[PDB]
Coordinates of C-alpha atoms and ligand atoms in Angstrom, one line a residue:
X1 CA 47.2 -31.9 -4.1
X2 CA 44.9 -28.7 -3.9
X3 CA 41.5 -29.8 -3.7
X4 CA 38.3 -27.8 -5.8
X5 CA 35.3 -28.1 -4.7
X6 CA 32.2 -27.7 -6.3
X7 CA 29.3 -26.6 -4.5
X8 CA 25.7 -25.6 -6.6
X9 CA 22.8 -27.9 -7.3
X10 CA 22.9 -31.0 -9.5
X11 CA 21.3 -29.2 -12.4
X12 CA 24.0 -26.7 -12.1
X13 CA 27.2 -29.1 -10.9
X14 CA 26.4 -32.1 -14.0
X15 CA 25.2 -29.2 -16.5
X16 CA 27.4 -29.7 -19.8
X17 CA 29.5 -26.6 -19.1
X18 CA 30.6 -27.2 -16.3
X19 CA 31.3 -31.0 -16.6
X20 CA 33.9 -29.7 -20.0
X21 CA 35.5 -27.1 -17.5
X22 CA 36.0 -29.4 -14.8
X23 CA 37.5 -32.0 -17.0
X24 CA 40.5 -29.4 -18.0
X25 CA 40.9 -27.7 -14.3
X26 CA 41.3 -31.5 -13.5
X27 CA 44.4 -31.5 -16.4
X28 CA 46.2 -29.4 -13.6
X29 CA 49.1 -31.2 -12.0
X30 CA 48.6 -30.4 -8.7
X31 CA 44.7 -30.2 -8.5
X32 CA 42.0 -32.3 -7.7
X33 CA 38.2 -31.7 -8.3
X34 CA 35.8 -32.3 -5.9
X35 CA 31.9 -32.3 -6.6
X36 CA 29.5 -31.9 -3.8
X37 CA 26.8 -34.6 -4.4
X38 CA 23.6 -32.5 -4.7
X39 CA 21.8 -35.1 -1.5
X40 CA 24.9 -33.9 0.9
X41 CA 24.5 -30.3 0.0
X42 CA 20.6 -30.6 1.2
X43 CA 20.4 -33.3 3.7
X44 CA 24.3 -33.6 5.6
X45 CA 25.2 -31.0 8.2
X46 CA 28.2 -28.3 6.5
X47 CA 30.6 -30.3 9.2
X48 CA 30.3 -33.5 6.9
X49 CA 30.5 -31.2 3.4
X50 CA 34.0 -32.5 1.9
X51 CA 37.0 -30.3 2.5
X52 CA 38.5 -28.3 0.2
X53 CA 41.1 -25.5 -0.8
X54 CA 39.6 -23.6 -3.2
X55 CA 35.7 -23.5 -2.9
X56 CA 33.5 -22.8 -5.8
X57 CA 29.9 -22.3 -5.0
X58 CA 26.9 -20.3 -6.4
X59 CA 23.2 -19.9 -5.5
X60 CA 20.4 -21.1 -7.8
X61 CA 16.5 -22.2 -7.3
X62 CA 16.9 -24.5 -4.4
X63 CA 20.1 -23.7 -2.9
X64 CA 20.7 -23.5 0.9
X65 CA 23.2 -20.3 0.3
X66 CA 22.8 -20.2 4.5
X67 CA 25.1 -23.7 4.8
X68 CA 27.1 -22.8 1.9
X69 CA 28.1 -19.7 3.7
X70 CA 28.6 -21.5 7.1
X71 CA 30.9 -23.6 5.0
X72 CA 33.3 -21.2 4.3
X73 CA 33.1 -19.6 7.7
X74 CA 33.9 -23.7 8.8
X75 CA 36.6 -24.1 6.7
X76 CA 38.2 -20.8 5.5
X77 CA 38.5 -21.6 1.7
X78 CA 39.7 -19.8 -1.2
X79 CA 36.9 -18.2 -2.0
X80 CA 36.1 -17.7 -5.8
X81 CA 32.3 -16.5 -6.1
X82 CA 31.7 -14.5 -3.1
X83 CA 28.8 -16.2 -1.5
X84 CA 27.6 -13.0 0.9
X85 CA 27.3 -10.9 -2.2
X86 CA 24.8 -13.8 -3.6
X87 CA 22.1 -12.7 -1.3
X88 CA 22.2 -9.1 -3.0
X89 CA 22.7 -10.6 -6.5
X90 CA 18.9 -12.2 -5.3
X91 CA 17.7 -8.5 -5.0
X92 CA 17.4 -6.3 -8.3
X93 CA 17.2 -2.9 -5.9
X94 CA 20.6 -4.0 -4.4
X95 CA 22.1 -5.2 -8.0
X96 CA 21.1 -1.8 -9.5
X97 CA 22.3 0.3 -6.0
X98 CA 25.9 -1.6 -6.3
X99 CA 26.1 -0.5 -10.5
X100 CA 25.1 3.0 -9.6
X101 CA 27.6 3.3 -7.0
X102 CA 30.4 1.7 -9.2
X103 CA 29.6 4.7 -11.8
X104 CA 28.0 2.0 -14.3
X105 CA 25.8 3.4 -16.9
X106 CA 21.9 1.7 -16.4
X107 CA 18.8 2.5 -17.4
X108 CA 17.0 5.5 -15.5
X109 CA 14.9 3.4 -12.8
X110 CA 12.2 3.8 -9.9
X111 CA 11.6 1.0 -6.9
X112 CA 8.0 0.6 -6.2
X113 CA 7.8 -1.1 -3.2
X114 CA 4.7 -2.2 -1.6
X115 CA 5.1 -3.7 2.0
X116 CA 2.1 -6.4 2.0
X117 CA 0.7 -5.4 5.5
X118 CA 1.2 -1.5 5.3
X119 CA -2.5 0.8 4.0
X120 CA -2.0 -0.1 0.5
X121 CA -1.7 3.9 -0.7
X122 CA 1.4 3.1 -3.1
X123 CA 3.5 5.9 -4.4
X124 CA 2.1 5.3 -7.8
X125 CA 0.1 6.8 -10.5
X126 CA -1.0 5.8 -13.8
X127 CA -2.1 7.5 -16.6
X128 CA -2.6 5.8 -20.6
X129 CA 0.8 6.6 -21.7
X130 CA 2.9 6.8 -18.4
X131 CA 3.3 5.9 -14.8
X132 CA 4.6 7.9 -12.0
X133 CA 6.6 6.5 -9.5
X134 CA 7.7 8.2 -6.3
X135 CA 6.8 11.6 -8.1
X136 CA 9.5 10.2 -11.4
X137 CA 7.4 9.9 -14.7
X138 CA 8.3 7.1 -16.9
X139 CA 6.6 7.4 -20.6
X140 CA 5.5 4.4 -22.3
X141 CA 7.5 2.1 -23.6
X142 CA 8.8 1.4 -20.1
X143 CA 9.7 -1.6 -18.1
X144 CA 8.3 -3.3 -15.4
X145 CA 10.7 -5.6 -13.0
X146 CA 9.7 -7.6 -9.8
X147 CA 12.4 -7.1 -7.4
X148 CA 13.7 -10.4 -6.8
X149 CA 15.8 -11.2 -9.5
X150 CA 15.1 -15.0 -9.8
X151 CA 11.7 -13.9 -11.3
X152 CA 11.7 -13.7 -14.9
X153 CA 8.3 -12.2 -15.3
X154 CA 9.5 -8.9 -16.8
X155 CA 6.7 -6.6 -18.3
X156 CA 7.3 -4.1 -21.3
X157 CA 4.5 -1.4 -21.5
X158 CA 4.2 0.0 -25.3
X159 CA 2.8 3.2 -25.8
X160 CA -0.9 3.9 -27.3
X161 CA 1.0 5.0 -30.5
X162 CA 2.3 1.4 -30.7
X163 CA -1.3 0.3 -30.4
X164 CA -0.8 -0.2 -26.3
X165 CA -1.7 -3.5 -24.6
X166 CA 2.0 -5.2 -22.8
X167 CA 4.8 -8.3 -23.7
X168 CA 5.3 -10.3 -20.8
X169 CA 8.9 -11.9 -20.9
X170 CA 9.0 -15.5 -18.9
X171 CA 12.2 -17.9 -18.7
X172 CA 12.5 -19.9 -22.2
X173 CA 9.9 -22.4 -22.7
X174 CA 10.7 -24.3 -25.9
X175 CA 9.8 -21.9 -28.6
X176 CA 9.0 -18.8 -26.6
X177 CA 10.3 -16.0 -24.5
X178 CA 7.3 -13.8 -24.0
X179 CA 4.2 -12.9 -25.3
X180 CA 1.7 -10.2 -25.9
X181 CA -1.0 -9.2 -23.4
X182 CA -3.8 -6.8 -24.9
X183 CA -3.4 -5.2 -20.8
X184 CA -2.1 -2.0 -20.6
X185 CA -2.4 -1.9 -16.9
X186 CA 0.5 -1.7 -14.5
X187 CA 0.7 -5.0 -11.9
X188 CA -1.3 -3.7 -8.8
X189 CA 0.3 -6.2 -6.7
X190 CA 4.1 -6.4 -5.5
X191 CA 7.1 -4.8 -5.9
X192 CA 8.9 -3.5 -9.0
X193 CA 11.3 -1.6 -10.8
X194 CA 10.4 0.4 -13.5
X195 CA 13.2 1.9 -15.8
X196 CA 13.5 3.2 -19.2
X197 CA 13.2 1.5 -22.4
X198 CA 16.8 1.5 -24.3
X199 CA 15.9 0.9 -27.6
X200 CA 18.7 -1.4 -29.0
X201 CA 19.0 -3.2 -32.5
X202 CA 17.1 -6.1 -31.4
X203 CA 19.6 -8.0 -29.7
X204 CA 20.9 -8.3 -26.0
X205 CA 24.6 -8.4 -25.4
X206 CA 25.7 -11.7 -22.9
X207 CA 28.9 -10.9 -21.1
X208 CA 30.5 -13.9 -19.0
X209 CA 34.1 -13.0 -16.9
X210 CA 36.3 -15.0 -15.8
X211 CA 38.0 -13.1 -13.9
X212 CA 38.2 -9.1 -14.2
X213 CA 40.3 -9.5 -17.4
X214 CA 38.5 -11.8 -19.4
X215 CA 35.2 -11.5 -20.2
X216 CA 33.3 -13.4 -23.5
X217 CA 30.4 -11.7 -25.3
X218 CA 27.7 -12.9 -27.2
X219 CA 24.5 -11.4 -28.4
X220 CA 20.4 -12.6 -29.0
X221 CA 17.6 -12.0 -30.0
X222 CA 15.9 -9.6 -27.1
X223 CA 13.0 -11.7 -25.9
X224 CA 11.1 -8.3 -25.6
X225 CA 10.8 -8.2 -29.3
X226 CA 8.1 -10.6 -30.2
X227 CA 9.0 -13.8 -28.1
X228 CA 9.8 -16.3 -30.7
X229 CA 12.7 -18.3 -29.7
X230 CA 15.4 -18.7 -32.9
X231 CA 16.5 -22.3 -32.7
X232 CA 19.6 -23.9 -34.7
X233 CA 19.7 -28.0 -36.1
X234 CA 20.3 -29.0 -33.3
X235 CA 17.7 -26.9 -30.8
X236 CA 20.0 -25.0 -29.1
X237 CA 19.7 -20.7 -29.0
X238 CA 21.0 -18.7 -31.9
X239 CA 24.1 -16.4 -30.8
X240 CA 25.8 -14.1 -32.3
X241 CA 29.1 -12.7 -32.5
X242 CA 30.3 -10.0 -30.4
X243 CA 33.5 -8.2 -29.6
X244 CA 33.6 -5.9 -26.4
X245 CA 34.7 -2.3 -26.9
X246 CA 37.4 -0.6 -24.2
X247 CA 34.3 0.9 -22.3
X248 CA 32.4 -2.3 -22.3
X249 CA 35.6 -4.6 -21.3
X250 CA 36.1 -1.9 -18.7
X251 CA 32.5 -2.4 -17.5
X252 CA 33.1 -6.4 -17.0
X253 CA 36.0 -5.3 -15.1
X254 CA 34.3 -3.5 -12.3
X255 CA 31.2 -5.8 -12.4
X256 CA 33.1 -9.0 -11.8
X257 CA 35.3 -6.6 -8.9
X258 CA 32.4 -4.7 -7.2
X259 CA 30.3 -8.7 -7.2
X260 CA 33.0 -10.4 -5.9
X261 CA 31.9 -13.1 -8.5
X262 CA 35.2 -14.2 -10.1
X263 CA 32.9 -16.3 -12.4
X264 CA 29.8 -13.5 -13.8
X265 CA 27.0 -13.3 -16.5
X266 CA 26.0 -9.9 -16.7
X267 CA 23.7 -8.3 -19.8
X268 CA 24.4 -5.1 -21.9
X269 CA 21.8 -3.0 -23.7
X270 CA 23.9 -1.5 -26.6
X271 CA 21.8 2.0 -27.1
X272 CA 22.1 5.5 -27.8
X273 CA 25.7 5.0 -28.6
X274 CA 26.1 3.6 -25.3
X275 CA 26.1 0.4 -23.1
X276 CA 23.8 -0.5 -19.9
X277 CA 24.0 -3.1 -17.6
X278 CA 20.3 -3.7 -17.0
X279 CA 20.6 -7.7 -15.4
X280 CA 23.9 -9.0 -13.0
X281 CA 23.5 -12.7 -12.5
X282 CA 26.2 -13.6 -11.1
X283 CA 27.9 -17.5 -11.6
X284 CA 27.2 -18.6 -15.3
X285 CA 29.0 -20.4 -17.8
X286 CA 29.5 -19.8 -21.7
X287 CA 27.7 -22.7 -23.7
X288 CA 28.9 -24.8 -26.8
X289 CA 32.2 -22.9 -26.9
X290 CA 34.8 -25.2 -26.5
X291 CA 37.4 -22.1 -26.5
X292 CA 35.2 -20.9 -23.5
X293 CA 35.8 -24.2 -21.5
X294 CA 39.8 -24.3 -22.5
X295 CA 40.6 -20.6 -21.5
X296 CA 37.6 -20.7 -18.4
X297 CA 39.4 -23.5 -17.4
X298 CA 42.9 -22.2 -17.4
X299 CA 42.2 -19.0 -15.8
X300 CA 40.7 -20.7 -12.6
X301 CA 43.1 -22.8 -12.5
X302 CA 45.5 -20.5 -12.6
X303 CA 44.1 -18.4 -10.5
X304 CA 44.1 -21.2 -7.8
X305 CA 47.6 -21.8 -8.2
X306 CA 48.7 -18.2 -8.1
X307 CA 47.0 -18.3 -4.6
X308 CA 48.2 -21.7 -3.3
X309 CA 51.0 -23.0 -4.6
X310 CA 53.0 -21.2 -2.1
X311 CA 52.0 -22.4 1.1
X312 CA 51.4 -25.8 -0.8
X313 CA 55.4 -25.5 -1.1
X314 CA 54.3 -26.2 -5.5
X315 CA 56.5 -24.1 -8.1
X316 CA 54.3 -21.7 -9.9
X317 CA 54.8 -19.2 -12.6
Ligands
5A3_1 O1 16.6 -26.0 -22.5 P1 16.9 -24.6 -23.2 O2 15.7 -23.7 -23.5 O3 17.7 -25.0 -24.6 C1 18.2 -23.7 -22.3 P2 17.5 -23.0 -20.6 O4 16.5 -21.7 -20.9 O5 16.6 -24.2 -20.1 O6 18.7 -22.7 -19.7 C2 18.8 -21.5 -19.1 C3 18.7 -21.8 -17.6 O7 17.3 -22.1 -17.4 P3 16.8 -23.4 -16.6 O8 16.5 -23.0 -15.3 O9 15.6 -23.7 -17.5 O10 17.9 -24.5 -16.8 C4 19.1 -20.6 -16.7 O11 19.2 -21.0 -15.3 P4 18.2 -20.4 -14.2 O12 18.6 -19.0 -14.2 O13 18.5 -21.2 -13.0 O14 16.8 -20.6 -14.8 C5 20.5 -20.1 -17.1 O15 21.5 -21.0 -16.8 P5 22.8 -20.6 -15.9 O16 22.4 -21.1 -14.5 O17 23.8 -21.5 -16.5 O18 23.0 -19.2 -16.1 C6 20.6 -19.7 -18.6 O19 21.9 -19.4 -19.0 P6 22.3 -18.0 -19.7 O20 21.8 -17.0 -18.7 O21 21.5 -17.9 -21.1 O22 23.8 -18.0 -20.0 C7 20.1 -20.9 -19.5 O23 20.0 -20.4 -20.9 P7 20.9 -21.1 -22.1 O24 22.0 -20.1 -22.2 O25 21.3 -22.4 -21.7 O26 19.9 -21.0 -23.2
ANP2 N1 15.7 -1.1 -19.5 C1 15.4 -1.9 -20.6 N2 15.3 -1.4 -21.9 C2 15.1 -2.2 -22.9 N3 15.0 -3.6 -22.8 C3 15.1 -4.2 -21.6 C4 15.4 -3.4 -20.4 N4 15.5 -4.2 -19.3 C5 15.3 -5.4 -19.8 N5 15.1 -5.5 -21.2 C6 14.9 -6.7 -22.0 O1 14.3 -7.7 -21.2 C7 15.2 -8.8 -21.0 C8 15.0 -9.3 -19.6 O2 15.5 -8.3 -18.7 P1 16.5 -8.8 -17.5 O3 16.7 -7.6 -16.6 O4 17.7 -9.4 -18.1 O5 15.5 -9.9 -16.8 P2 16.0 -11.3 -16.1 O6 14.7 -11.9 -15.7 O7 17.0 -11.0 -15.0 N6 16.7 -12.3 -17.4 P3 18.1 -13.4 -17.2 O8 19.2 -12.9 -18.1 O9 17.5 -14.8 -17.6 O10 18.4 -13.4 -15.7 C9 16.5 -8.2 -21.4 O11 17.5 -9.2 -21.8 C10 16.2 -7.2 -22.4 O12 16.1 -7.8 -23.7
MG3 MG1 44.7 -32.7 -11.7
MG4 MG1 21.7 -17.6 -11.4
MG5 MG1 14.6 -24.4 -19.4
MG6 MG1 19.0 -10.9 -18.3
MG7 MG1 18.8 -11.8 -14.5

């Protein structure tokens, strides 16, 4: 038997999503599924982390990415989510610098940062209607990004013609995903990026690969319009359907490549006749799609027989 292990946080490794996937990988005749209990990941040493084959293992708030990396180097796994890449997927500088490289259309952006200890004479200025940022002007509406990714405090700057004042984004809390702030000021401390603000229809675009040929889409409600959540009967986020066009499917292609995440949310701003990546967050999971968790569930395991039933001496085609 090829063994899978499963390496996140319990949050992450009993979430509903993943316990549906791991059910059908587990359908696979020559694979077994194995969880790593959350208290091992913390408290045991890597060396008494349970083997595995195929190792599937993602950062999130709390994780030690340090063991899970000195894992693999232990044990030489089949890696699925590259873990080395989940350091940069931390940084929104070094998500955007990877896109840019990769010739991915993103919003037109600035790095203000401010290093704590240096004479704080940062390379910004502010006007009413504007900032300038390392001599780049970014009219209002603009927005406002601290670097590290896992920080969800994202600030949109409206214009005085919009009646000014801010909306301050935050991760969902029951009703809400931001709110308006009469402040029109910049954040004086930290670092950010700003970028552009691509008007859209009102909705984001979620894209989740599985692999650089499959990638689901969904759309919501932008949290930077007014911040009220839309719940269905049964409290859950309303989605909406999307299809991917050849550019975009193209896009999910050389996001889940250049990340080396096998498994990848990633968000598109549909604007201007266009589509920009403006958020890469690496390991996610579709929710309440039950074709999701069939075809997710395939494809991995596919993809882990296709690269070990051979030495495994297990017929595959
Ligand atoms: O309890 P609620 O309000 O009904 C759902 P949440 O805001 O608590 O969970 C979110 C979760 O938030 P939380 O941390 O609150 O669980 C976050 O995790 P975080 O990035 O670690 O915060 C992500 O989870 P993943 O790790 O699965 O991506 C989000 O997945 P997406 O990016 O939207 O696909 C989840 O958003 P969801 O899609 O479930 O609404
Ligand atoms: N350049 C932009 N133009 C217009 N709207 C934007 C822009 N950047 C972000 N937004 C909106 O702000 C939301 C949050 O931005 P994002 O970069 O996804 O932050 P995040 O904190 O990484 N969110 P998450 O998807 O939970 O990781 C997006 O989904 C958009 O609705
Ligand atoms: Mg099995
Ligand atoms: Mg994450
Ligand atoms: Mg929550
Ligand atoms: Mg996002
Ligand atoms: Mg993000």
């Amino acid at each position: 038997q090829i063994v899978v292990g499963i390496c996140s946080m319990a949050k992450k490794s009993k979430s509903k999503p993943m316990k549906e996937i791991l059910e059908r990988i587990s359908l696979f005749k020559y694979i077994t599924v194995v969880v790593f209990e959350e208290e091992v990941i913390l408290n045991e040493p890597v060396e008494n982390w349970p083997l595995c084959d195929c190792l599937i293992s993602f950062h999130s708030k709390g994780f030690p990415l340090d063991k899970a990396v000195a894992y693999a180097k232990l044990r030489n796994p089949f890696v699925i989510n590259d873990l080395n890449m989940q350091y940069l997927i931390q940084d929104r500088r070094e998500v955007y610098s990877i896109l840019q490289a990769e010739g991915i259309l993103l919003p037109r952006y600035a790095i203000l940062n401010r290093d704590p200890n240096n004479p704080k004479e940062c390379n910004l200025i502010e006007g009413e209607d504007h900032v300038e940022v390392n001599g780049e002007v970014f009219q209002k509406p603009f927005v406002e990004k601290p670097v590290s990714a896992e920080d969800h405090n994202v600030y949109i700057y409206y214009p005085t013609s919009a009646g000014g004042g801010s909306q301050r984004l935050f991760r969902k809390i029951g009703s809400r995903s931001s709110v308006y702030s009469p402040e029109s000021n910049v954040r004086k401390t930290g670092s950010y990026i700003y970028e552009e603000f691509m008007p859209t229809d009102g909705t984001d675009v979620k894209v989740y690969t599985v692999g650089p040929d499959y990638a689901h889409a969904e759309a919501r409600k932008s949290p930077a319009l007014d911040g009220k959540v839309e719940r269905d009967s049964e409290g859950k986020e309303v989605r909406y359907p999307v299809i991917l066009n050849a550019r975009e499917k193209l896009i999910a292609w050389k996001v889940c490549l250049a990340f080396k995440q096998t498994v990848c949310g990633f968000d598109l701003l549909r604007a201007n006749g266009q589509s920009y990546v403006c958020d890469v967050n690496g390991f996610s999971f579709v929710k309440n799609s039950m074709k999701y968790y069939d075809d997710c569930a395939k494809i991995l395991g596919n993809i882990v027989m296709r690269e070990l039933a051979p030495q495994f001496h297990i017929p595959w085609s």
